[PDB]
Write a protein that binds this ligand. Structure first.
Ligand SMILES: Cn1cncc1[C@H](O)C1=Cc2cccnc2[C@@H](N2CCN(C(=O)OC(C)(C)C)CC2)c2ccc(Cl)cc21
Ligand SMILES: CC(C)=CCC/C(C)=C/CC/C(C)=C/COP(=O)(O)OP(=O)(O)O
Ligand SMILES: [Mg+2]
Ligand SMILES: [Zn+2]
Lengths: 403, 315
């Protein structure tokens, strides 16, 4: 019918296991049967399909979570700036305002997470780490007040990034920590937003990230590892920031990412032969605007002037039909419990799937009710494009710190 | 003298005699809190005591046992892991007992980043990789796609030069699940770091093995990605027999993967000044249209992009 996933021909997209069953085919078939039940529900209940983003339920879930969380969140006690970021960004995508008092309370809490040696920890008094540093800077840029900008100690932040920098061009996540592509992205994101990029900070970084692109076309956590959506987004987004996307084979990358959209489910998988997951709506589909900008900068004449190189409609259908929790919040797939991480990325991926843009060109695809339209998101930073412009302009009136 | 966190006789640190001297330090969440977690009593109790030993930098046997509880409560707390490693060195703890502990904790939470990083630090300290491959194989026996397990496996093999039995282990896992992409990745990792793919006998063996895998399971994307990945290097057009050999699977072993591979062969032929240039282009454009409209419509935008791209370049 008007919904791609509900067309009779869509039944042909089901798994073809070639009569050879393995753990992979068995697990995929189970997910497909579950998704088919969701897709068929309208037909079985004799109702007209209505794709509605449950804005009010999502807002209630988010406004509450911003102040207080159950003990189910104990496993995120060293990730508190991530929770600020996930919630504040989900509220920004839903066009929900931050009361000036809440903005102030977030600023003050992120100040407590900030290390006297630079960067942010996952909670008050915790050691600094690149992942809560990225989340804290992103959350402060979402608030975007002078008070939020002033929380960041730019000189100590630069000193902190230098303390993690490795001779091979990579970065540690934290002191005595692990090295992987996420760290290059977390460092490049905070350094570009706060205007602390010195001539040698990212020396060898582009080359180290390019060594993470493997035989599949995608990018692994470290050289030699299996290509993965989260790492591929981190790798490409860091190269966009560094203006070094050409270090990658962009065509093998384009082919690998597009192949990650599931023909049946419509959503994206994180790796080849794994299951669909709503958060890959951002990590994987977020690569298509980055590749479009990269190919366009090389003057590609065959690029679309209205759509991203993925099925925008099928992704929105997967998110709207399978990833909404009735009580508010979004999830990985049907049968999974809601969480602020999936709420953030399902809505981020929905915004990307709704909003196309390339220079002068602007084209929206809004599946279901028109009220489903979200605020746009910057494909590099995953914060509002207006917040990116405002933060960059503000930090550009400050000099890059000296030694 | 361990008192397990799940033990029916576990007692809160605030009710323990050997901890009476120390005042627990509460978390400073500020006056108006945000993303405040309503911690369970057990969690709050261990973390208020951990905050006290950390703030005073107490490098004691009791602080060491306390980190085990704090890790058990939240194994992602990297500050706790850092302090535990400070204590392992300061207290001169037996690192083989610490390996027994990390083995048990990884078995419980095999997806946690911190646990694998700690195991790597221990292996580095001990300069002992002897237990590694067998421990990883036990994790992979439970989840054959565990990304941290495969990453630790590659680190182990590369660092300690344990290449010799890896292709055999890869062959075993591929028999179990030919669709396991992490295993196809390991295959490439092993070959590229040993013989390489420049050795013609190795390349031939790999392409034949992959083609036999494709015949058994034609819709298995991993084997198709692997065949492409090992040949795309020198260029698909460099292998003239490949096209005819795939075109001979068109009635029997067809899939949008076979069709997509044909388009990749045609793209490369068109870039390397092939004979019957206009014929190749139209063959490629026909397959692009079939893929976009019929066989692979989820990728319609990609296939239309390729169609336009091929036209723009090779018209
Ligand atoms: C890779 N992937 C893709 N879908 C999911 C994942 C992973 O589960 C995953 C994603 C991720 C990405 C960025 C920052 N933090 C995390 C974190 N999540 C944990 C679960 N969670 C969460 O709310 O759980 C509750 C409180 C409901 C139990 C959301 C945050 C995490 C922490 C350790 C590890 Cl090994 C993996 C992950
Ligand atoms: C900026 C930043 C910190 C980005 C993080 C990116 C991200 C999502 C990373 C995931 C890394 C990883 C080892 C996943 C494996 O888990 P899995 O078993 O869930 O993978 P799968 O979904 O393919 O099964
Ligand atoms: Mg760590
Ligand atoms: Zn997910």
């Amino acid at each position: 019918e008007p919904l791609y996933s509900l067309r009779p021909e869509h039944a042909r997209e089901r798994l073809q296991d070639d009569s050879v069953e393995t753990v992979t085919s068995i697990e995929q078939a189970k997910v497909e049967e579950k998704i088919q039940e969701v897709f068929s529900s309208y037909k079985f209940n004799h109702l007209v399909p209505r794709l509605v983003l449950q804005r009010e339920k999502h807002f209630h879930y988010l406004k509450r979570g911003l102040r207080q969380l159950t003990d189910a969140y104990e496993c995120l006690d060293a990730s508190r700036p991530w929770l600020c970021y996930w919630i504040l960004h989900s509220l920004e995508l839903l066009d929900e305002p931050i009361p000036q008092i809440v903005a102030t309370d977030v600023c003050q809490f992120l100040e407590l997470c900030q290390s006297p040696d630079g960067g942010f920890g996952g909670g008050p008094g915790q050691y600094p780490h690149l992942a809560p540093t990225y989340a804290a800077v992103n959350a402060l840029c979402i608030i975007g007040t002078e008070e939020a900008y002033n929380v960041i100690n730019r000189e100590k932040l630069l000193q902190y990034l230098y303390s993690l920098k490795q001779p091979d061009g990579s970065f540690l996540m934290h002191v005595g920590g692990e090295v992987d592509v996420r760290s290059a992205y977390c460092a490049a994101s905070v350094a570009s937003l706060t205007n602390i990029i010195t001539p040698d900070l990212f020396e060898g970084t582009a080359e180290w990230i390019a060594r993470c692109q493997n035989w599949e076309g995608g990018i692994g956590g470290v050289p030699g590892m299996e290509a993965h959506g989260g790492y591929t987004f981190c790798g490409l987004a860091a190269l966009v920031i560094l203006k070094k996307e050409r270090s990658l084979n962009l065509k093998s990358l384009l082919q690998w990412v597009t192949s990650r959209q599931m023909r049946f489910e419509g959503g994206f998988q994180g790796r080849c032969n794994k299951l669909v997951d709503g958060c890959y709506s951002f990590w994987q589909a977020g690569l298509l605007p980055l590749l479009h900008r990269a190919l366009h900068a090389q003057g590609d004449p065959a690029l679309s002037m209205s759509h991203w190189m993925f099925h925008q409609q099928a992704l929105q259908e997967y998110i709207l039909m399978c990833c909404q929790c009735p009580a508010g919040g979004l999830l990985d797939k049907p049968g999974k419990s809601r969480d602020f991480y999936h709420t953030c990325y399902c809505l981020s991926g929905l915004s990307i799937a709704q909003h196309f843009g390339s220079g002068a060109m602007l084209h929206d695809v809004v599946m279901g009710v028109p009220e489903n339209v979200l605020q746009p998101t910057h494909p590099v930073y995953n914060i509002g494009p207006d917040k990116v412009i405002q933060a960059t302009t503000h930090f550009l009136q400050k000099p890059v710190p000296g030694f | 003298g361990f008192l397990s966190l799940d033990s029916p006789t576990y007692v809160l640190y605030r009710d323990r005699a050997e901890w009476a001297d120390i005042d627990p330090v509460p978390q400073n969440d500020g006056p108006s809190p945000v993303v405040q977690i309503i911690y369970s009593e057990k969690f709050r109790d261990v973390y208020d005591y951990f905050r006290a030993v950390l703030q005073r930098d107490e490098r004691s046997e009791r602080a060491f046992k306390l980190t085990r509880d704090a890790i058990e409560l939240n194994a992602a707390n990297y500050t706790v892991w850092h302090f535990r490693r400070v204590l392992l060195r300061s207290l001169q703890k037996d690192l083989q007992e610490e390996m027994n502990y990390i083995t048990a904790i990884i078995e419980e939470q095999p997806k946690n980043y911190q646990v694998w990083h700690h195991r790597r630090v221990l292996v580095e300290w001990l300069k002992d990789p002897s237990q590694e491959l067998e421990f990883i194989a036990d994790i992979l026996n439970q989840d054959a796609k565990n990304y941290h397990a495969w990453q630790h496996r590659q680190w182990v093999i590369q660092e300690f030069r344990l290449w010799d039995n890896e292709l055999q282990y890869v062959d075993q896992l591929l028999k179990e699940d030919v669709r396991n992409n992490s295993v196809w990745n390991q295959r490439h990792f092993v070959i590229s770091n040993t013989t390489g793919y420049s050795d013609r006998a190795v390349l031939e063996r790999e392409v034949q093995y992959t083609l036999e895998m494709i015949k058994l399971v034609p819709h298995n994307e991993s084997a198709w990605n692997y065949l492409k990945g090992i040949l795309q290097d020198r260029g698909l057009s460099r292998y003239p027999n490949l096209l005819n050999q795939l075109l001979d699977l068109q009635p029997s072993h067809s899939s949008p993967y076979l069709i997509a591979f044909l388009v990749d062969i045609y793209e490369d032929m068109l870039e390397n000044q092939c004979d019957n240039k206009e014929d190749i282009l139209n063959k490629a454009l026909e397959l692009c249209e079939i893929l976009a409209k019929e066989k692979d419509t989820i990728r319609k935008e990609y296939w239309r992009y390729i169609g336009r791209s091929l036209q723009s370049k090779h018209s």
